[PDB]
Amino acid sequence: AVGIGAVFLGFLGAAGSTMGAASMTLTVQARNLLSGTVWGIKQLQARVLAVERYLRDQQLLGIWGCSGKLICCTNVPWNSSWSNRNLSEIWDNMTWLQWDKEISNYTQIIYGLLEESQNQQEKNEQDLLALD
Amino acid sequence: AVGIGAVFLGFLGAAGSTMGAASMTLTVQARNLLSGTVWGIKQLQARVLAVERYLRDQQLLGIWGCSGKLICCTNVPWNSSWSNRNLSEIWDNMTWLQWDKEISNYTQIIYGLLEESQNQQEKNEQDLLALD
Amino acid sequence: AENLWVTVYYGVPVWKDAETTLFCASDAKAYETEKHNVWATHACVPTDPNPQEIHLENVTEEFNMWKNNMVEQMHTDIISLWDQSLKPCVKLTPLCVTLQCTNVTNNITDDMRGELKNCSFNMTTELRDKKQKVYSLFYRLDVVQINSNKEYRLINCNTSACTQACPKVSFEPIPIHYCAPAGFAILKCKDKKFNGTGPCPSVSTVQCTHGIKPVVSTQLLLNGSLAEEEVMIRSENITNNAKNILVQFNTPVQINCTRPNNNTRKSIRIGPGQAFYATGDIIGDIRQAHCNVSKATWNETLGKVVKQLRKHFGNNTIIRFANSSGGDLEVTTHSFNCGGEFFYCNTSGLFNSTWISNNDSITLPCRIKQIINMWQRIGQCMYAPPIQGVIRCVSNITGLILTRDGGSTNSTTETFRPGGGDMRDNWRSELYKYKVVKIEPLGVAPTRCKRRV
Amino acid sequence: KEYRLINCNTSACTQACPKVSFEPIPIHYCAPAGFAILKCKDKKFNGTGPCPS
Amino acid sequence: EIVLTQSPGILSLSPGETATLFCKASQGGNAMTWYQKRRGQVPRLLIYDTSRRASGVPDRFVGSGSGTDFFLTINKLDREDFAVYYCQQFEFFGLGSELEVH
Amino acid sequence: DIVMTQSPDSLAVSLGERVTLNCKSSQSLLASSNNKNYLAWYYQKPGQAPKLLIYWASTRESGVPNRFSGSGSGSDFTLTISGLQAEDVAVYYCQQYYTTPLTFGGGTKVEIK
Amino acid sequence: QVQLVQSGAVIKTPGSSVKISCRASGYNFRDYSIHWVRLIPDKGFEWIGWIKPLWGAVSYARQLQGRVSMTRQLSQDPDDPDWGVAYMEFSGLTPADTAEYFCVRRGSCDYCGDFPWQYWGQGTVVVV
Ligand SMILES: *[C@@H]1O[C@H](CO)[C@@H](O[C@@H]2O[C@H](CO)[C@@H](O[C@@H]3O[C@H](CO[C@H]4O[C@H](CO)[C@@H](O)[C@H](O)[C@@H]4O)[C@@H](O)[C@H](O[C@H]4O[C@H](CO)[C@@H](O)[C@H](O)[C@@H]4O)[C@@H]3O)[C@H](O)[C@H]2NC(C)=O)[C@H](O)[C@H]1NC(C)=O
Ligand SMILES: *[C@@H]1O[C@H](CO)[C@@H](O[C@@H]2O[C@H](CO)[C@@H](O[C@@H]3O[C@H](CO)[C@@H](O)[C@H](O[C@H]4O[C@H](CO)[C@@H](O)[C@H](O)[C@@H]4O)[C@@H]3O)[C@H](O)[C@H]2NC(C)=O)[C@H](O)[C@H]1NC(C)=O
Ligand SMILES: *[C@@H]1O[C@H](CO)[C@@H](O[C@@H]2O[C@H](CO)[C@@H](O[C@@H]3O[C@H](CO)[C@@H](O)[C@H](O[C@H]4O[C@H](CO)[C@@H](O)[C@H](O)[C@@H]4O)[C@@H]3O)[C@H](O)[C@H]2NC(C)=O)[C@H](O)[C@H]1NC(C)=O
Ligand SMILES: *[C@@H]1O[C@H](CO)[C@@H](O[C@@H]2O[C@H](CO)[C@@H](O[C@@H]3O[C@H](CO)[C@@H](O)[C@H](O)[C@@H]3O)[C@H](O)[C@H]2NC(C)=O)[C@H](O)[C@H]1NC(C)=O
Ligand SMILES: *[C@@H]1O[C@H](CO)[C@@H](O[C@@H]2O[C@H](CO)[C@@H](O)[C@H](O)[C@H]2NC(C)=O)[C@H](O)[C@H]1NC(C)=O
Ligand SMILES: *[C@@H]1O[C@H](CO)[C@@H](O[C@@H]2O[C@H](CO)[C@@H](O)[C@H](O)[C@H]2NC(C)=O)[C@H](O)[C@H]1NC(C)=O
Ligand SMILES: *[C@@H]1O[C@H](CO)[C@@H](O[C@@H]2O[C@H](CO)[C@@H](O)[C@H](O)[C@H]2NC(C)=O)[C@H](O)[C@H]1NC(C)=O
Ligand SMILES: *[C@@H]1O[C@H](CO)[C@@H](O[C@@H]2O[C@H](CO)[C@@H](O)[C@H](O)[C@H]2NC(C)=O)[C@H](O)[C@H]1NC(C)=O
Ligand SMILES: *[C@@H]1O[C@H](CO)[C@@H](O[C@@H]2O[C@H](CO)[C@@H](O)[C@H](O)[C@H]2NC(C)=O)[C@H](O)[C@H]1NC(C)=O
Ligand SMILES: *[C@@H]1O[C@H](CO)[C@@H](O[C@@H]2O[C@H](CO)[C@@H](O)[C@H](O)[C@H]2NC(C)=O)[C@H](O)[C@H]1NC(C)=O
Ligand SMILES: *[C@@H]1O[C@H](CO)[C@@H](O[C@@H]2O[C@H](CO)[C@@H](O)[C@H](O)[C@H]2NC(C)=O)[C@H](O)[C@H]1NC(C)=O
Ligand SMILES: *[C@@H]1O[C@H](CO)[C@@H](O[C@@H]2O[C@H](CO)[C@@H](O)[C@H](O)[C@H]2NC(C)=O)[C@H](O)[C@H]1NC(C)=O
Ligand SMILES: *[C@@H]1O[C@H](CO)[C@@H](O)[C@H](O)[C@H]1NC(C)=O
Ligand SMILES: *[C@@H]1O[C@H](CO)[C@@H](O)[C@H](O)[C@H]1NC(C)=O
Ligand SMILES: *[C@@H]1O[C@H](CO)[C@@H](O)[C@H](O)[C@H]1NC(C)=O
Ligand SMILES: *[C@@H]1O[C@H](CO)[C@@H](O)[C@H](O)[C@H]1NC(C)=O
Ligand SMILES: *[C@@H]1O[C@H](CO)[C@@H](O)[C@H](O)[C@H]1NC(C)=O
Ligand SMILES: *[C@@H]1O[C@H](CO)[C@@H](O)[C@H](O)[C@H]1NC(C)=O
Description:
Chains A, B: It is a single-pass type I membrane protein. By secondary structure, chain C is mainly beta.
């Protein structure tokens, strides 16, 4: 879902667009997330906070299936007790600012399942290599 | 194209060798790129500049196909308007110091095509998983 | 197959020219000393002497010592590091006072002048009630008469309170290694006949620089780096007369320098934990500080530098050497520091030559100052304490800093004056080899393979 | 008729240096990486509540 | 010494025309500097480094040439642009190229 | 928003010689990511639909001959003509396409004197 | 701004020793060299000499040595360091030295050399 258009398509440009349309511009927010006598200390701790946050997010990705995919799929199924709404009414109706609030309570339940499924898939892969 | 030899084979050792021969020693420059009352501020900002540059380069790799390959291939073809020269007269004739100048003007045209092809391949992969 | 496919490679050896902040380093024996008896002993990382270098084959980079960076960095860092070893020291606020000065006890000759004044003054004691009367010995160059009675004052009583150089810390040179951070490299030119401008055919990468002893000398740069086989003259542009010519020659010229006066350091209590180290007695003869070079080897090295100067000026050129045209004290007479003592030695015996296109020793007299105005700041002078005993030191004249006069109206000759000027000409004679580059990975190149989906 | 300064019993009074000036020059407050700054372009916005633009 | 020689000398041109002023160096390999002195006024840097224009000079002063041949080309001669022109190499000067009005 | 201000209001010259025009922006249009800049120089005739002249703030359109040059980066931009024709003497426009809302210049009406 | 302001004109006797000052204001006077250049009617520009005012390092024209002498006077205060006074004592005055004298300074660009003189004093007319 990308077409020909000459406008800049910049950082947080599609924050209000629906989340089926902001997904076609995710490398922009990924790009503009890292590079940007006493005050050098303040600037320096701001820069190390930036690189620490980037490393924490890349570590959360890396212990899951995707390390540099930027769109990755996994093997845990969507529990319908979490959001109980249709597939057609998320990708064409709501935004990420509005979808963030609706699963913020069910966040950190999902991440443990992601790590659990990735650890189980790693040990299944190790056993499948080991039986050969 | 690697053989038996006892010399150190160190950092920037093959900078003047042809680029078909400096490609067999690329983990050396990849290795020696990160680790190395007022002056602690200068040393500290030099170190965070080093890790920021390393993170920027790893982020440019990661939004493309290769995240840790260190040699990766992709799906955009070489436009012959860029360098208009034979394949035999790059890997056996010139160096990276000399090939850097010859496509420095056509740089940043190539990187957008790399991100475009990687985003298109990610959405094609997502649709191919989705139809199954 | 004629369609090529692009591939990005990481770890590609290729650099651009860049400007970064190198960091200081010292040797392990220089790291062994402690408690700031020299400058910044624990601030810098320890490293090896002659740090590790590897040679790069079939490479050619153009260098320029004149538009080079990191001589600016070394100049700024040595000025700031000179300043930072003075904040714990003692300010001479209570010593700006009326000095009742008489002549030193000596057979006075009315034609010549005594270079020492015996000055008595009121000094505040450690108690804020009582003051004492104490005398000292100063030089003519450090006191001026204010307007029968003969009362003097210091020359810097109307510009600054003068920070005493602490006698704990020494001013000897210890070699700095300028090390590059990660991502940057340093290239050294191993070429013999390389004038610091243009393409160097033989470079080598190195992590840190070789040892640079910080010497402070206006004319006749001392303990420097010797040239390989012949004298090399180096300038940004020869025909410009406002550019200095840096002359580096092969075998060094041994110079001896001495103050033969045996002095007595005497402590004076200014206040609580405040001590002023003054001159007490002159034990023995009142003699003049001087230096010696060898007559024969100086004539030899002048013949060598005329032989090398005739390559840029034609063969039938008469090369003559005359002394400095004028200026302040430390731009006309060659300054140095012989162990915590600042000498100003007359070079008129050295540059007194003419050269046609066909066991002795030069004595040269010196003056000594106790208060100095290094780098010509607006409000920062420096008292330097006297030191005990006869002071002698041996050094190597490594090069010269020459300046051609404004030759016009059919100049059959071309004359050369010595001149110190900026300190960076002293610093460009050591970082003329090196440059700093930014190593940039992620090259990109075509090859005949498409990624298998 | 002898006077004194009013601040003789509280502080030694630091002279403003005549080299440095006190004219205003515009500061731009820039955000680091990972943070953004949002500006409200709404006309009738009293600084409280929802900004639509 | 660098002997500089200016070839046109006295040149009379109508306003609105173009002027070409030649300077000839006895020793080549260096840059050339172009100054303008009006009558009873202080001289002004026009061109340094043989092509670069100074601060506060209009674009029609075009320096060119190299070696021993150095050209100052003025296009669309203003009334104020009729003065004496000098070429400097390092400390030497030309004898003046007067630009008079026909 | 972003104010696009053209510095002259009109330019009545003779035909054959070159001219130059400028458009200043209230905001630096130089995209730091692409390292390329965002001006559309347009040309509207009397009573006609406009056409592009300069895209990416420097590059001429196909069908436009070599006598135009979009120039300059950052915030201030210059359309330099090399030779004036009778087909050219109508209104020029500068446009930022960096953000919404898309704002144009004032329109410098060049005619023949 | 950067201003080089000289003293007024003067009439001297044959054999005198004229002294012309040049107050520089608007920049760090310790940085830039000050050149002295003259203008003689029907002889053109002649260069007299430069001074580096950080230590007063002078250099003279070859045919004017023994006659010219340049000094300087810096600004010694932490409040107004942006001024200075150059001097030139030109001695051995002959009627062939009737000329207009100039203290000049190079431009502050990164390709301005020593001799590309941007700034110019108003000049002192000396009749001997
Ligand atoms: C060019 O290079 C030469 C070669 O290094 C330099 O010459 C050295 O200069 C330093 C400092 O000027 C000299 O160091 C001083 O030497 C004095 C003489 O004593 C020497 O001999 C005794 C007995 O053999 C040794 O124990 C001693 O270490 C010396 O080798 C000493 O009196 C000084 O020591 C005093 O001061 C220090 C300061 O911290 C204290 O630690 C001591 O305890 C003591 O109080 C000092 O050591 C050195 O001797 C010179 N070497 C030679 C071979 O002459 C030139 O100075 C240099 N030129 C310039 C301009 O820097
Ligand atoms: C650096 O050193 C040089 C020499 O090492 C030094 O040059 C000498 O300076 C003095 C004065 O500064 C010159 O002047 C002399 O001063 C005495 C003082 O009474 C005069 O009497 C001398 O005259 C004698 O010589 C004349 C010529 O021979 C006779 O005609 C006369 O009757 C006297 O006998 C003399 O003028 C001295 O000449 C120079 N030396 C030389 C060789 O020129 C220089 O000053 C030092 N630098 C600094 C900054 O001090
Ligand atoms: C004294 O000697 C030094 C050492 O050579 C000399 O410095 C050089 O000056 C030139 C300019 O005069 C510098 O610029 C270069 O010039 C060459 C030849 O023109 C070109 O490679 C480049 O200039 C091009 O670009 C300019 C602007 O874009 C154009 O105006 C020009 O026509 C060219 O097209 C390049 O910029 C050069 O870098 C220095 N080199 C060094 C090593 O310092 C100095 O100029 C001499 N003094 C005098 C008064 O000539
Ligand atoms: C370079 O060498 C020359 C030649 O020796 C030096 O010139 C000499 O300079 C001294 C001053 O240092 C002159 O001494 C004079 O002494 C009388 C004594 O009363 C004094 O009144 C004068 O004002 C002057 O100081 C001496 O005449 C002079 N000689 C000549 C031939 O010019 C010059 O100083 C040396 N330069 C340096 C930097 O050492
Ligand atoms: C410097 O002057 C002081 C006087 O202020 C001299 O000290 C006196 O010297 C005489 C002669 O021996 C003694 O009798 C006095 O007792 C000394 N007085 C003090 C307070 O010490 C001193 O000798 C002079 N020194 C020099 C080198 O000239
Ligand atoms: C003490 O120093 C003073 C200077 O402050 C001497 O006075 C002059 O010294 C110079 C050179 O030393 C002589 O040429 C003058 O003739 C001296 N002036 C007089 C009036 O004689 C003084 O000679 C020194 N000695 C004594 C014993 O006072
Ligand atoms: C040190 O202090 C004493 C006392 O304050 C000074 O001596 C005075 O000098 C003046 C001027 O000659 C006389 O009128 C006073 O009678 C002196 N007082 C005493 C108690 O002697 C002296 O000048 C100061 N300086 C030195 C070098 O001793
Ligand atoms: C330093 O050596 C370089 C050569 O490596 C000289 O540079 C060349 O000089 C010739 C004239 O002799 C010019 O034609 C070249 O264009 C110069 N090349 C470059 C790259 O500048 C230079 O003249 C020498 N400098 C000195 C002071 O001797
Ligand atoms: C400088 O003077 C001191 C005197 O203060 C000399 O030191 C004395 O030297 C002799 C023998 O050389 C010893 O017997 C004394 O005990 C020493 N006295 C002190 C206080 O140290 C010193 O030798 C002299 N220096 C020179 C080079 O002559
Ligand atoms: C400078 O001083 C050195 C001493 O450091 C002198 O070298 C000595 O010379 C004598 C002969 O004059 C020899 O007997 C010694 O063996 C030498 N000693 C050393 C350590 O080399 C040198 O001659 C002096 N030079 C001058 C010009 O005075
Ligand atoms: C001056 O240079 C000479 C070399 O010309 C230095 O002498 C050498 O010093 C090293 C160690 O410092 C010795 O290993 C060599 O054997 C010496 N060679 C000769 C020929 O003497 C000398 O050290 C330098 N410094 C001084 C102060 O003279
Ligand atoms: C500023 O405007 C806001 C509306 O954007 C006002 O807030 C509302 O005020 C009404 C009463 O007039 C309340 O019923 C709402 O609950 C308020 N909404 C919010 C989000 O606070 C606010 O009163 C205005 N303030 C001023 C000082 O005029
Ligand atoms: C999360 O908890 C809050 C507070 O109990 C509740 O209001 C909210 O509905 C919960 N989230 C979801 C998605 O139900
Ligand atoms: C890039 O642009 C420069 C300047 O216009 C040009 O000289 C160069 O040839 C261009 N690069 C290539 C590979 O053509
Ligand atoms: C300080 O006094 C000396 C001697 O009178 C004088 O030369 C100098 O100019 C004075 N400095 C100031 C800043 O007044
Ligand atoms: C000077 O003579 C030498 C002979 O040793 C020669 O090599 C050099 O080329 C000559 N130079 C000139 C300018 O004649
Ligand atoms: C110059 O040399 C001569 C002879 O060598 C000597 O007599 C004279 O003193 C020297 N000049 C100076 C100023 O020392
Ligand atoms: C200082 O003196 C003034 C005047 O008497 C008085 O008003 C003030 O309270 C005093 N402040 C203190 C701290 O004593």
